[PDB]
RNA sequence: AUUAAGACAUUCGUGAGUGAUUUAUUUCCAUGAAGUGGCGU
């Protein structure tokens, strides 16, 4: 298969700077680089360089010389648009 | 006065007719709006 369509659960609230949109959800700008780093670390059995050579051999890298990025497309969309919005501070107030 | 004399290689005639500088090509690739709390044991 060429597509992975995962449904994920929220356990603790996310602090979001672009909250003014009702479609605000997980930003793949954080997920994709960290997921690439994690995937390559697992590929090399704990070593990032070995995983990079692994992805280099299997042609999974966008670039084989410069960066850590893997070739796939990440999309995160809200199914139901209802949001529970929290105020987060350091002290307790009435 | 002599196998001599006389006679513009000249007249007319469009370098013209037909014809896309067009076809193909992602302004894209990488990238965390994030980090930290401090003060009177």
Instruction: Confirm whether any atom of chain B, the nucleic acid strand, is less than 7 Å from CB of A90.
Output: yes
> Is the separation of the CB atoms in A74 and A67 below 8 Å?
no
Alpha helices, DSSP H, located in A16-62: 28-43, 48-57
Alpha-carbon distance of A92 to A77, in angstroms, equals 34
Resolution (A): 2.8
Instruction: Confirm whether any atom of chain B, the nucleic acid strand, is less than 7 Å from CB of A65.
Output: no
Distance A28 CA to B9 C1' (A): 92
CA dihedral over A34, A38, A44, A46, signed as positive or negative: positive
Distance A66 CA to B36 C1' (A): 31
Alpha-carbon distance of A46 to A32, in angstroms, equals 19
Contacts of A27 (CB under 8 A, 6+ apart): A16, A18, A76
Of A32, A31, A51, nearest to A40 by C-alpha is A51
Instruction: Confirm whether any atom of chain B, the nucleic acid strand, is less than 7 Å from CB of A44.
Output: no
Distance A71 CA to B21 C1' (A): 38
Q: CA-based Rg of chain A, rounded to a whole angstrom?
A: 18
């Amino acid at each position: 298969m060429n597509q992975l369509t995962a449904i994920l659960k929220q356990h603790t609230p996310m602090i979001h700077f672009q909250h003014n949109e009702s479609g605000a959800t997980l930003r793949a700008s954080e997920v994709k680089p960290l997921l690439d780093k994690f995937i390559l670390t697992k590929l090399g059995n704990g070593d990032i360089r070995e995983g990079r050579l692994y992805a280099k051999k299997n042609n999974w890298l966008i670039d084989n010389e410069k960066n850590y990025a893997l070739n796939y497309k990440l999309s995160i969309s809200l199914q139901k648009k209802s949001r529970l919005e929290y105020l987060i501070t350091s002290s307790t107030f009435p």
